[PDB]
Structures are given as structure tokens and as C-alpha cells.
Paper text:
Indeed, URH1p was initially classified as a nucleoside hydrolase (NH) with a pronounced preference for uridine substrate but was later shown to also participate in a Preiss-Handler-dependent pathway for recycling of both endogenous and exogenous nicotinamide riboside (NR) towards NAD+ synthesis. We show that the URH1p has similar catalytic efficiencies for hydrolysis of NR and uridine, advocating a dual role of the enzyme in both NAD+ synthesis and nucleobase salvage. The crystal structure of URH1p showed that the enzyme belongs to the group I structural homology group of the Ca2+-dependent NHs and displays a monomeric structure that is unprecedented in this class of enzymes. The yeast URH1p, a cytosolic enzyme, was found to exhibit uridine and NR hydrolase activity, contributing both to the cell’s ability to recover uracil for nucleotide biosynthesis and maintain a balanced pool of nucleotides for DNA, RNA and cofactor synthesis and to regulate NAD+ concentration through the Preiss-Handler shunt.
The asymmetric unit of the hexagonal crystals contains two URH1p monomers, covalently linked by a disulphide bridge involving residue Cys142 from both chains. Making only marginal non-covalent interactions between the two protein monomers in the asymmetric unit, it is thus evident that the URH1p dimer found in the crystal is principally caused by an adventitious disulphide bridge between Cys142 residues, not representing a physiologically relevant quaternary arrangement. The URH1p structure retains the characteristic open (α, β) NH fold that is composed of an eight-stranded central mixed β-sheet (β1-β7 and β10) surrounded by the connecting α-helices, a helical domain that completes the active site, and two additional antiparallel β-strands (β8 and β9) extending away from the core sheet. The crystal structure of URH1p closely resembles the “closed” conformation observed for the ligand-bound NHs, with an ordered loop that connects strand β3 to helices α3.1 and α3.2 (the so-called “β3-α3 loop”) and a defined conformation of the α8 helix with only its short C-terminal portion (amino acids 242 to 246) flexible, as judged by the weak electron density. Since ligand-free group I NHs typically display high flexibility in the β3-α3 loop and α8 helix, we infer that the contacts with the Tris molecule found in the active site stabilise the observed closed conformation. Indeed, the side chain imidazole ring of His86, a crucial residue in modulating NH activity and structural dynamics, is within hydrogen bonding distance from one hydroxyl of the Tris molecule, and this interaction is likely pivotal for the closed conformation of the β3-α3 loop. Further contacts are observed between the Tris molecule and amino acid residues Asn42, Thr130, Asn165, Glu173, Asn175 and Asp255, whose homologues are involved in substrate binding in other NHs.
Author numbering: 4 to 241, 247 to 340
Write the structure that this text describes.
């Protein structure tokens, strides 16, 4: 009756909105969160996640584990330019977290539980690196055939990117190309992977119209203010229309595929392709996506590559979630 999910993220301004959806959208049973390295160091992305949940009141519902703390191979390089030093700069409203990251078990064990608990029905959602999920599947490969979908925000098609000398690579793939390949090339997994690339996410712009919706004379919670202050800082690091909010877009295909709403509503269109990426770090196009193969639209084989969705609908979902979050705000 409700889409069970695990979220691996690196908050992260756009990742904060991913958490908001998974916590508060009526369609999602969030089973837990794993934080990886990426936008900031792993200690920051951990704290940032637990701070958000504490602000939204969800710090005693949503289990938090520390995920992958570093890439498989490459030296960790973070993004201070876009996200700041804490990885979530621009808002002082973020409260000191009530709860610790849980240590009853490894994150691999926690994800193992969650998958088996929702055997065949769960979807894993990576808004950060693919290191967390690639490690789970290395260590516990039996778990592959239990996950229904893996919804990834990452990659860019046709040499679209925000990383590497040529801007040919997208961040989440670039920070661990090995982990990405291990996912994209595995025949068990690649066929049920959903990829939401820069091509698609760059449609998810937070314009003046969107900011009005988050904060206005009718609706001016401090929680609402927090989320506004994120959108603003994200925009300051840019698209004159405003900044794209990449990570929540990975939730939309699930709403269509699990059939929360009709495809007419969600409007999620996609292709079927095998993909890989350049994982030689010394390569100038390090991380750039290669399209290995392409398939007819009725194909079962191939990674599911997002092309278009209804951006109106996207935003309606975020606002829906935000009105419920507002009721559970712990910071005024
Ligand atoms: Ca992210």
C-alpha cells in the first residue's frame, strides 16, 4: 500500500529535499537512511542528515546509519564550491541532532534487514555516490534479486557533466567510477536500475514561483524558512532562472512504476540502455558515461534512463510533503 525505500544520500542541499519526500510524501515508507561521503566529509553528511530529521521531528522514526565513508579506489574530493564547508551552508536553523547514528549493526546489515523485510518490493535510492550500494552487493550478492528497483540520481548523457576537466562527468559517478561500473555492468542489477541524469534533472529548476510556494505570508514556519534558505544558497552557487534540484527527481519514477499515480500524471519517459563509465582517474574524461548498448522501448534488458517527466507534478509532490513536514516541525 506504500512504497518501501532505503535512502543513501550525502546532504547536500538537494539531498535534504530527497529526505523530505521520503519522510513525508504519502507514498513512501522510508525504512532507513545511509549517509556517504560526497558533497561534504562523511561526518558532515551524517550530522546534516540527523539535523534535518530532528528539525522535521522524524529523528525517532527513521533509522540513520553511516554508509560508505570513502570511494572504493580514488582519493576523496568534495565539493565546497556548491555546498560549502559543512555541506549544507546557508541556514542556521538546522538544530543539534537528538539521536546518534545507530551502531547496533553495520550499514550493510541494516540494508540487508530492510531488503529482506520487503523482499521483492523495496527500492534503493542513491542520491550520493554508488559506493554504499556497490559494497552491499559485493558482500551480500544474494540480496540483488530482492530489490525491485534501484533509483539513482547520477551521470549525464552525451558528455553532459559538472565534473572533471571537460565537465563530461557528473559528480556522484565521478567520485567513485568503480562503484558505478560495478552497478551498471552487473547483469543481475543493471536491468532494474533507474538512472536520472543531469539531462533530466536540469529541468527541475527552483524558480521564483517555487520559492513563493515554500515560504509566504500564509506559510512562514521556521522549518519552511530553513528549506527556503537552502534553495537560496543553492541558487547563489549558480542557470539564471534558478538552481536545479536533482536528487528528489529519483523518487518520481517510483511513483509511476509502483503506480502511486498514473503515467499521465507523473509523465516519466525513459529509454533502455546498457551504460558504463571511464574509471581511469588519470583520464581527462574521468567519470564520463559511455552508452554501451541501446534497446527497443519494449525491452526487459537495459538500464532505465530518464528523459522527461512532468515538472509541475514533481513540485506538487514536494509541496505536499512540505505541508506535512510543517506539522511536525520542532524548530517553530
Ligand atoms: Ca546527493
Amino acid at each position: 500500500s506504500k512504497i518501501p525505500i532505503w535512502l543513501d544520500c550525502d546532504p547536500g542541499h538537494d539531498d535534504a529535499i530527497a529526505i523530505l519526500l521520503g519522510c513525508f510524501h504519502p507514498a513512501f515508507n522510508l525504512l532507513g537512511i545511509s549517509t556517504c561521503f560526497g558533497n561534504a566529509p562523511p561526518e558532515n553528511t551524517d550530522y546534516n542528515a540527523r539535523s534535518l530529521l530532528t528539525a522535521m521531528g522524524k529523528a525517532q522514526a527513521i533509522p540513520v546509519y553511516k554508509g560508505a565513508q570513502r570511494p572504493w579506489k580514488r582519493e576523496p574530493h568534495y565539493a565546497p564550491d556548491i555546498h560549502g564547508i559543512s555541506g549544507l551552508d546557508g541556514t542556521s536553523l538546522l538544530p543539534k541532532p537528538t539521536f546518534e547514528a545507530r551502531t547496533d549493526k553495520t550499514y550493510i546489515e541494516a540494508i540487508e534487514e530492510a531488503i529482506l523485510a520487503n523482499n521483492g518490493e523495496i527500492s534503493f535510492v542513491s542520491t550520493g555516490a554508488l559506493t554504499t550500494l556497490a559494497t552491499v552487493f559485493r558482500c551480500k550478492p544474494y540480496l540483488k534479486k530482492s530489490v525491485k528497483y534501484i533509483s539513482i540520481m547520477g551521470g549525464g548523457l552525451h558528455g553532459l557533466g559538472n565534473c572533471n576537466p571537460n565537465l563530461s562527468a557528473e559528480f556522484n559517478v565521478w567520485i567513485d567510477p568503480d562503484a558505478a561500473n560495478y552497478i551498471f555492468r552487473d547483469p543481475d542489477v543493471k536491468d532494474k536500475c533507474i538512472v536520472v541524469p543531469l539531462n533530466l534533472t536540469h529541468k527541475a529548476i527552483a524558480t521564483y514561483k517555487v520559492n513563493e510556494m515554500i515560504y509566504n505570508e500564509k506559510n512562514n514556519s521556521k522549518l519552511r524558512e530553513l528549506f527556503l534558505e537552502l534553495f537560496q544558497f543553492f541558487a547563489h552557487t549558480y542557470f539564471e532562472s534558478g538552481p536545479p534540484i536533482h536528487d528528489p527527481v529519483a523518487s518520481m519514477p517510483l511513483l509511476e512504476f509502483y503506480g502511486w499515480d498514473p503515467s499521465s500524471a507523473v509523465g516519466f519517459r525513459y529509454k533502455r540502455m546498457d551504460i558504463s563509465c571511464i574509471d581511469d582517474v588519470f583520464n581527462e574524461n574521468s567519470g564520463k558515461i559511455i552508452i554501451e548498448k541501446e534497446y527497443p522501448n519494449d525491452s526487459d534488458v537495459g538500464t532505465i534512463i530518464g528523459l522527461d517527466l512532468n515538472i509541475q507534478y514533481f513540485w506538487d509532490q514536494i509541496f505536499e510533503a512540505l505541508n506535512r513536514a510543517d506539522k511536525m516541525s520542532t524548530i517553530g
